[PDB]
Design a protein around this ligand. Structure first.
Ligand SMILES: [K+]
Ligand SMILES: [K+]
Ligand SMILES: [K+]
Ligand SMILES: [K+]
Ligand SMILES: [K+]
Ligand SMILES: [K+]
Ligand SMILES: [K+]
Ligand SMILES: [K+]
Ligand SMILES: [K+]
Ligand SMILES: [K+]
Ligand SMILES: [K+]
Ligand SMILES: [K+]
Ligand SMILES: [K+]
Ligand SMILES: [K+]
Ligand SMILES: [K+]
Ligand SMILES: [K+]
Ligand SMILES: [K+]
Ligand SMILES: [K+]
Ligand SMILES: [K+]
Ligand SMILES: [K+]
Ligand SMILES: [Mg+2]
Ligand SMILES: [Mg+2]
Ligand SMILES: [Mg+2]
Ligand SMILES: [Mg+2]
Ligand SMILES: [Mg+2]
Ligand SMILES: [Mg+2]
Ligand SMILES: [Mg+2]
Ligand SMILES: [Mg+2]
Ligand SMILES: [Mg+2]
Ligand SMILES: [Mg+2]
Ligand SMILES: [Mg+2]
Ligand SMILES: [Mg+2]
Ligand SMILES: [Mg+2]
Ligand SMILES: [Mg+2]
Ligand SMILES: [Mg+2]
Ligand SMILES: [Mg+2]
Ligand SMILES: [Mg+2]
Ligand SMILES: [Mg+2]
Ligand SMILES: [Mg+2]
Ligand SMILES: [Mg+2]
Ligand SMILES: [Mg+2]
Ligand SMILES: [Mg+2]
Ligand SMILES: [Mg+2]
Ligand SMILES: [Mg+2]
Ligand SMILES: [Mg+2]
Ligand SMILES: [Mg+2]
Ligand SMILES: [Mg+2]
Ligand SMILES: [Mg+2]
Ligand SMILES: [Mg+2]
Ligand SMILES: [Mg+2]
Ligand SMILES: [Mg+2]
Ligand SMILES: [Mg+2]
Ligand SMILES: [Mg+2]
Ligand SMILES: [Mg+2]
Ligand SMILES: [Mg+2]
Ligand SMILES: [Mg+2]
Ligand SMILES: [Mg+2]
Ligand SMILES: [Mg+2]
Ligand SMILES: [Mg+2]
Ligand SMILES: [Mg+2]
Lengths: 147, 51, 127, 101, 41, 142, 132, 186, 52
RNA sequence: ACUGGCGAGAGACCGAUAGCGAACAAGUACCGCGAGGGAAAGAUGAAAAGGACUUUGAAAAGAGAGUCAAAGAGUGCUUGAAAUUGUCGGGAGGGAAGCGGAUGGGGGCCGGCGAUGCGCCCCGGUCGGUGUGGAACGGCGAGCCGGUCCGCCGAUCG
RNA sequence: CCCGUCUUGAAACACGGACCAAGGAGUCUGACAUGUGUGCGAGUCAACGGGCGAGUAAACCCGUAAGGCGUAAGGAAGCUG
RNA sequence: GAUGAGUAGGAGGGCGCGGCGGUCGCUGCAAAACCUUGGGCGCGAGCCUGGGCGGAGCGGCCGUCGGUGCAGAUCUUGGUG
RNA sequence: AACGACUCUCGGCAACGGAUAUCUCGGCUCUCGCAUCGAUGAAGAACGUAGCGAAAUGCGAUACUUGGUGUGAAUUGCAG
């Protein structure tokens, strides 16, 4: 929006806000990331530690699908069950719902948070952390593995 | 705006209500205002405030 | 109509603020411009130089925008717009817009007489 | 010579406002049309309109002739607003008149 | 429940309940912002 | 309006077809409102004819020095053609003055507009007399 | 509003097509209304002006004048009418050009083609306007 | 001359009004301008000031955090100058009276199902003109991405400030200056 | 270069202005493809328009 | 896919120092041995009705006259700014002038530049007046509380 | 004391400026960032495309295991979370 | 109630130019532009108006947009001392 | 130290110049449709060609056009 640009407020002020002494020259410090080690050294070290150098192993032709592993925490597991199925869970304590996280696009079950009180759940997943399994078991549930 | 009877009767289905959602705008609900009653005079001159 | 204003109008300055050196150069118009030059003696407010406008010259808020006749001007373009001043005839006077035809000025002038609304330029283009 | 910063076709002409905001704007406009004070404030002449919102029988949808369409507007009191539009027909001031406007 | 009268034309239920959309908030700021941006399209 | 008047004022106070502004938005700015139900033609929430359910209209009626006194009906805010309760008055000023005081202040319709309504009636009545006969005094003394 | 994709609403294109139109096209553009008597007779509203037609001027300073066409000056978008003249500074007489849309045809120069044209113009009106 | 700073005038800036053009918010400001002036209530003064604040100064409050702070205070009315969001991590929602500028669709449904009530600030004025028996709450102001980048620069000692990097991985600011094996660790 | 900002990596050092692809024909492309489908449907009638 | 060719539609684009170099006999006139370089230049009037004739002059042309709504539109002619120039009128000037502030002299300009009403009396004229009838409505919420208009009595003032 | 300008310092024997008209310079775009306005909110986004539609370059509708960003981090990695 | 300097620089509130979406108007009983020893308003950018010329268009207000404001650049083109 | 000349200055008129305003058969940009040069001699170049023409436009010794078809009374600056 041109009418809000501050250059308009500076019309008639000679230097357009860039000063009489310093002026606005083309590239008085080099272009782009020039001088990262010489005259912009302080800037890089102060704000971008680790910028220069090499670390770790290369991986030629690394495909990300091999590493696909979405995770879901314990505290979020109950939210996957439909509301109508939640009522059934509290209506019969003999059985427990079977939550197959893979059907909801999750592979591994992590163990952040707690489960609903007095509600056993059977969790079906590809992978699971030890804390997640412990919390499921101590709540009266069980873990089933799939692929 | 001049509404035909058929068009006027479709407004609830198209835009839904504050309680149930629209039938043609999947998962849409009418927005709520930050002020339920915009009549300041009633609020300011109410017995509760004036007491 | 009797003007409602009663406080006298005090003009802090009646001369205009002329742009510096507009006398010297034809291309430099008289409309005010703040001199931005580093050495500008006008900007630096040396005595015996052109004066610059500042807020201290502001007129009294009670008498601001009041014409010498004691009313404030409102520009009218037809008879309907003139009726807006019926309840403010002691405060606002009407001025017919410069581009209104002489035929429509007669209607406005006649209507203003009925409403006791002052017209600043009622004699315009009637000869 | 060459103008400063010549205009380019790949200027960002269009805008994509979120759909939910566009629906919010439409709902507000629909609600505003049922308030006679707002309708009058926008310049519409609805002094002879029987009621707002103005809902008419579905038989109006069967009208085929423009002469019958105008008679329908007269019956419901909407003709004065339509007459205002015709009487306001005028040539656009400025350069727009030679730009097919 | 509020209802709206249905005007009848010459040569032709007479009320309809007021739809909820007619009670929606009036937000001139939102309308102006949306109107200006979409009119560029 | 069908919605609260305070809400309407928030919407129409910035821009409406009846808003007349001149001399920009600086100190020289002058603002008037020209809706028929605004006694003083002032752009304010008090006198606004758009943002108040209860409004007073006083203007010449047809011919024969008749003055129209119309008030907006509280239960007809959604019926523009029947919103006004018109009362054409063609009697002496004193009789008309009592009628305005009765329909504005006595019934607690808009007591805050009693002074404006009487002045509006006084201005309208005087202009009708001048129209019939013509200007005879300049009203410049005092 | 127009809906034909082959038709332009551009002012520039309309004016160019009018002022560069060939002579055959200018003939149709230079049409005049028939008189109320001829309209009721042939059931035709407009006709291209011809050299030997008789017309009456209904607009301009020569309003009311009647005479016979003597020249259809298509290049100048005007027609010349017998006795509709003015005097130059030297006293010579020159015909005054009049746009054919500002005259009314009182008598038609009928011929084999003109009569056939009248039938086609009336045939459409007698069906598309009345029978519909 | 007078030996003062800036002619004795204040150089501080605070919001004296909302920056928004929302007509409903301005009506609420008018309502609470009157309440603060004519009552002298500290609750009303605080409410008025918070209505002026920007979006980031009115952070949302999760329903789960609302429940924890409302435990043992059923009689009191919860007041939030901001938005109340739903939290899937909370299972049991007790009945509670909550006043907020805005409720998310899921948060409103859960509160209403549990027998609670969702109030606006105009309804609060009718029930608590002086803020009597209210629980005034604020959402977490500094829990957002921008704040993680604030403070001492990432490269100075004893800094945990998050740097600005276009991606995350071994090749993005993990080298010299980030470990002893490459010059130094910082 | 100044202040705390992400390191810029704009790939605008070639003659990129000669290789800009605009999309002003996007509505036209939708129209043309719809016409092609409509024309194809009549050609293969009564065979299903969904194809094989 | 498509800044070429041919045809077509459109525009929050430019409006004759702009927009293509080119709105026009423009890739033209012109320049360069050559490869190449490359302009300026749109608008009388609705209609030529484009100024007969008289008189002066070698002629250009002037004076008068004529056409036109208009030559204060007269063939580079719509409108016709500034720099700059002539003339008439006012004024000033002992090696600059201009400029800020303050008055004065001389000009020019301004009747919303400055009013003539108001109150109380009677003479006349004119125009309307408590209580009951109708007409179309309203405020407050079934019921109370009202005004406007028309008519009829009384009242006899305004 | 002549303006504009660089300058510790300009009436300067520092430079530009004979005069007038018109033209004449922080823009567009990609990335990112803080701030603010608006919508929704553990979600959000109609973006390629499709269905259509002011007989229509707009508007309206469509995300079914789509995708982006967010919802979990640490490690060079194997991995753990 | 106190208080008033400001280069480089920052910000706010305003003035002016040309479009677009709206709205309110003006004009052959004379629009725009231009001229004026007419008058007035605003601290100011500017605005309003008388008279003249001109002979067909133009303006106010809300929103929104931009090839949007010149005394200078040995600035460009044209004109003139 | 008048008058007048000269210089400067203000106003009226007259010049000089072509700004401004209003225009526009042009330009620019976007979108769409179509696929058609040449040894059967192309693009380009040259010369010629009309009752009165130099250019532009057209044409080729059948030379601002022949023929067919459509349209249905002009062309036009003058002459015939
Ligand atoms: K700066
Ligand atoms: K493309
Ligand atoms: K050129
Ligand atoms: K002229
Ligand atoms: K310098
Ligand atoms: K130097
Ligand atoms: K110098
Ligand atoms: K930054
Ligand atoms: K997603
Ligand atoms: K989809
Ligand atoms: K490691
Ligand atoms: K307008
Ligand atoms: K003037
Ligand atoms: K604008
Ligand atoms: K002189
Ligand atoms: K002179
Ligand atoms: K021009
Ligand atoms: K050949
Ligand atoms: K030739
Ligand atoms: K032929
Ligand atoms: Mg500065
Ligand atoms: Mg500089
Ligand atoms: Mg620097
Ligand atoms: Mg740079
Ligand atoms: Mg002044
Ligand atoms: Mg200095
Ligand atoms: Mg004038
Ligand atoms: Mg203009
Ligand atoms: Mg002091
Ligand atoms: Mg200071
Ligand atoms: Mg090493
Ligand atoms: Mg260290
Ligand atoms: Mg390059
Ligand atoms: Mg092509
Ligand atoms: Mg050019
Ligand atoms: Mg121009
Ligand atoms: Mg003309
Ligand atoms: Mg001229
Ligand atoms: Mg001059
Ligand atoms: Mg030095
Ligand atoms: Mg200097
Ligand atoms: Mg020296
Ligand atoms: Mg130098
Ligand atoms: Mg020099
Ligand atoms: Mg300029
Ligand atoms: Mg943000
Ligand atoms: Mg996915
Ligand atoms: Mg490990
Ligand atoms: Mg200061
Ligand atoms: Mg303008
Ligand atoms: Mg002068
Ligand atoms: Mg203006
Ligand atoms: Mg432009
Ligand atoms: Mg520019
Ligand atoms: Mg200049
Ligand atoms: Mg400068
Ligand atoms: Mg120069
Ligand atoms: Mg030069
Ligand atoms: Mg010379
Ligand atoms: Mg030819």
């Amino acid at each position: 929006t041109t009418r809000f640009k501050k250059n308009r407020k500076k019309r008639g002020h000679v230097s357009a806000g860039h000063g009489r002494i310093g002026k606005h020259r083309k590239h008085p410090g080099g272009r782009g990331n020039a001088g990262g080690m010489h005259h912009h050294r302080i800037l890089f070290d102060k704000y971008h530690p680790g910028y220069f150098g090499k670390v770790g192993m290369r991986y030629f032709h690394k495909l990300r699908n091999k590493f696909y592993c979405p995770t879901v925490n314990i505290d979020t597991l109950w939210s996957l069950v439909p509301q109508e199925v939640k009522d059934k869970a509290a209506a019969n304590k003999g059985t427990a719902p079977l939550i197959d996280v893979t059907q909801f696009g999750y592979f591994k079950v992590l163990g952040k948070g707690v489960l609903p009180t007095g509600q056993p759940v059977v969790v079906k997943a590809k992978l699971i952390s030890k804390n997640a399994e412990k919390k499921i078991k101590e709540n009266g549930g069980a873990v089933v593995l799939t692929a | 705006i001049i509404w035909t009877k058929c068009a006027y009767e479709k407004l609830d289905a198209i835009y839904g209500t504050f309680d149930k959602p629209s039938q043609e705008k999947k998962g849409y609900l009418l927005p709520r205002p930050k002020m339920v009653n915009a009549d300041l005079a009633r609020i300011i001159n109410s017995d509760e405030v004036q007491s | 109509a009797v003007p409602l204003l009663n406080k006298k109008v005090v003009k802090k300055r009646v001369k205009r603020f002329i742009r510096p050196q507009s006398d010297r150069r034809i291309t430099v118009k008289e409309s005010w411009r703040r001199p931005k030059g580093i050495d500008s003696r006008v900007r630096r407010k040396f005595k015996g130089c052109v004066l610059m406008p500042n807020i201290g010259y502001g007129s009294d808020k009670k008498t601001r925008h009041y014409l010498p006749n004691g009313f404030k001007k409102f520009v009218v373009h037809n008879a309907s717009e003139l009726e807006i001043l019926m309840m403010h005839n002691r405060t606002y006077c009407a001025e017919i817009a410069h581009n209104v035809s002489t035929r429509k000025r007669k209607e406005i002038v006649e209507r203003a007489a009925q409403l006791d609304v002052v017209i600043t330029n009622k004699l315009a283009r009637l000869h | 010579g060459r103008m400063f910063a010549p205009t380019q076709t790949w200027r960002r002409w269009h805008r994509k406002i979120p759909v939910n905001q566009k629906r919010y704007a439409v709902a507000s406009a629909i609600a505003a049309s049922s308030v006679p004070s707002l309708v009058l404030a926008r310049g519409h002449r609805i002094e002879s309109v029987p009621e707002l919102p103005l809902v008419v029988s579905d038989s109006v949808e069967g009208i085929e002739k423009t002469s019958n369409a105008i008679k329908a507007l007269k019956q419901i009191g909407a003709y004065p607003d339509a007459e205002k539009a015709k009487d306001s027909h005028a040539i656009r001031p400025g350069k727009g008149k030679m730009r097919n406007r | 429940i509020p209802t709206t009268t249905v005007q009848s034309l010459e040569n032709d239920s007479a009320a309809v309940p007021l739809p909820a959309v007619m009670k929606a908030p009036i937000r001139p700021d939102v309308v102006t912002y949306v109107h200006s941006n979409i009119s560029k399209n | 309006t069908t919605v609260p008047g305070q809400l309407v004022w928030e919407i129409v106070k910035k821009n409406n077809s009846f808003l007349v502004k001149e001399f920009g938005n600086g100190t020289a700015g002058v603002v008037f409102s020209k809706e028929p139900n605004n006694l003083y033609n002032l752009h304010s929430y008090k006198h606004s004819g758009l943002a108040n359910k209860k409004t007073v209209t006083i203007q010449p009626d047809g011919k024969d020095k008749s003055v129209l006194l119309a008030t907006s009906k509280t239960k007809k805010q959604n019926k523009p053609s029947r919103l006004l309760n018109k009362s054409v008055m063609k009697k002496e000023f004193s009789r008309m003055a009592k009628a305005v005081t009765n329909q504005v202040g006595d019934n607690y319709y808009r007591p805050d507009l009693k002074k404006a309504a009487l002045a509006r009636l006084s201005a309208v009545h005087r202009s009708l007399k001048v129209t019939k006969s013509g200007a005879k005094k300049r009203n410049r003394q005092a | 509003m127009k809906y034909n994709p082959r038709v332009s609403s551009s002012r520039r294109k309309s004016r160019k097509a009018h002022f560069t139109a060939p002579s055959s096209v200018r003939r149709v553009l230079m049409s005049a209304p028939l008189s109320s008597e001829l309209r009721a007779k042939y059931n035709v509203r407009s006709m291209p002006v011809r050299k030997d037609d008789e017309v009456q001027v209904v607009r301009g300073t020569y309003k009311g004048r009647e005479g016979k066409v003597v020249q259809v000056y298509r290049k100048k978008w005007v027609i010349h009418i017998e006795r509709i003249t003015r005097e130059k500074v030297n006293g010579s007489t020159v015909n005054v050009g009049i746009n054919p849309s500002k005259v009314v045809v009182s008598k038609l120069r009928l011929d084999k083609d003109r009569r056939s044209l009248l039938d086609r113009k009336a045939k459409g009106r007698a069906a598309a306007d009345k029978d519909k | 001359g007078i030996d003062l700073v800036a002619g004795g005038k204040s150089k501080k800036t605070k919001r004296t009004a909302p920056k928004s053009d929302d007509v409903y918010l301005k009506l609420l400001v008018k309502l609470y301008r009157f309440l603060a002036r004519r009552t002298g209530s500290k609750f009303n003064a605080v409410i008025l000031k918070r209505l002026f604040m920007s979006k980031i100064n009115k952070p949302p409050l999760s329903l789960s955090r609302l429940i924890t702070y409302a435990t043992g205070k059923g009689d009191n009315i919860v007041v939030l100058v901001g938005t109340v969001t739903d939290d899937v991590r909370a299972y049991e929602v007790p009945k509670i009276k909550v006043c907020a500028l805005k409720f998310t669709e899921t948060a409103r449904a859960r509160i209403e199902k549990a027998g609670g009530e969702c109030l606006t600030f105009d309804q609060l004025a009718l029930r608590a003109p002086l803020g009597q028996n209210t629980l005034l709450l604020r959402g977490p102001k500094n829990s957002r991405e921008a704040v993680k980048h604030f403070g001492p620069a990432p490269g100075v000692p004893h800094s945990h400030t998050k740097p600005y990097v276009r991606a995350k991985g071994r090749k993005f600011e993990r080298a010299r200056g980030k470990r002893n094996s490459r010059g130094y660790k910082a | 270069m100044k202040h705390n900002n992400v390191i810029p990596n704009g790939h605008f050092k070639k003659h990129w202005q000669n290789y800009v692809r605009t999309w002003f024909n996007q509505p036209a492309r939708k129209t043309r493809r719809r016409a092609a489908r409509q024309k194809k449907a009549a050609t293969i009638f009564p065979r299903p328009t969904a194809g094989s």
